[PDB]
């Protein structure tokens, strides 16, 4: 499962310059090792400090204050494909940031065939008010007292035979 880890950067302090630039950033990854690897990869491109000269000080997890509150997360993404890299922006309705980023990755794999290697997370923020959701398919769920059915339900059974031929009513 995905997770959020916070990492900082204080590339080894040269003489008379302790704690340089306090390079703080947030990383989304499953385990700590992957989080550190992605942090190093991002640092190697955002600036010119190499991993050999760098040093990880501390890694702390950041959960969600209200993991039971539905939010319309705004997602800014920079990724690359067979063509040159280009920024992208998307909005996802999810309870938690980790779930939102997981669905973002799944959608990117679905439509854009992208993966963790080619996906870079720019920033994630919550939409504080309605009508700010540009994407129509996300604003759709924000209507007053939205109610819809689920026609043609699917079902599974352990037995390989049935004498009823049940209907898909739902």
């Amino acid at each position: 499962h995905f997770k959020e880890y916070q990492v900082i950067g204080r590339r080894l302090p040269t003489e008379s310059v302790p704690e340089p630039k306090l390079f703080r950033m947030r990383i989304f990854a499953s385990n700590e090792v992957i989080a550190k690897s992605r942090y190093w990869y991002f640092l190697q491109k955002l600036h010119k400090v190499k991993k050999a000269s760098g040093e990880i000080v501390s890694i702390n997890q950041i959960n969600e204050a209200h993991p039971t509150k539905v939010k319309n997360f705004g997602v800014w993404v920079r990724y690359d494909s067979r063509s040159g890299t280009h920024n992208m922006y998307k909005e996802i309705r999810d309870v938690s940031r980790v779930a939102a980023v997981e669905t973002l990755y799944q959608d990117m794999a679905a439509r854009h065939r992208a993966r963790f290697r080619s996906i870079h997370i720019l920033k994630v923020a919550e939409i504080e008010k309605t009508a700010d959701v540009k994407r129509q398919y996300v604003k759709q769920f924000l209507t007053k007292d939205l109610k819809f059915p689920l026609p043609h339900r699917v079902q599974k059974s352990t037995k390989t035979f049935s004498y009823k031929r049940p209907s898909t009513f739902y």
Partner: protein, 127 residues
């Protein structure tokens, strides 16, 4: 005429640790995932996919985004638990559970009672 997902809709969990426990929908996240709360049933507040949960034919009033306390208050006021017992769902579940728990002696008593009932029905037929 179909069961519609909506705030205050009572649902039954089909799989997972909370299987067989009732829950109420708090807010729909998307077509595939919805938020449910079942504090009376003991299932912790968590999101679940519609595939793992089957919608029951009962409903009760509930404001959107209701917290655990408000959800419990509405559950108590609506007495949806009492409605569930009178529904065929609860009767079928209880019948299935009781049969699996019958011991050998109880099973033999069941057979004897069934034989007596069959004899009485046959006597009370073709009169």
């Amino acid at each position: 005429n179909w069961r519609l997902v909506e705030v205050g809709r009572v649902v039954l969990i089909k799989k997972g640790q909370s299987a067989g426990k009732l829950a109420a929908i708090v807010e729909i996240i998307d077509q595939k995932k919805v938020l449910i709360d079942g504090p009376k049933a003991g299932v912790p507040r968590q999101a679940i996919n519609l595939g793992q949960v089957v919608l029951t034919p009962l409903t009760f009033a509930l404001p959107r985004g209701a917290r655990t306390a408000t959800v419990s208050k509405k559950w108590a006021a609506a007495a949806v638990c009492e409605k569930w017992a009178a529904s065929s769902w609860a009767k079928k579940i209880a019948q299935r559970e009781r049969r699996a728990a019958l011991t050998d002696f109880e099973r033999f008593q069941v057979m004897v009672l069934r034989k007596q009932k069959r004899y009485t029905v046959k006597k009370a037929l073709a009169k």
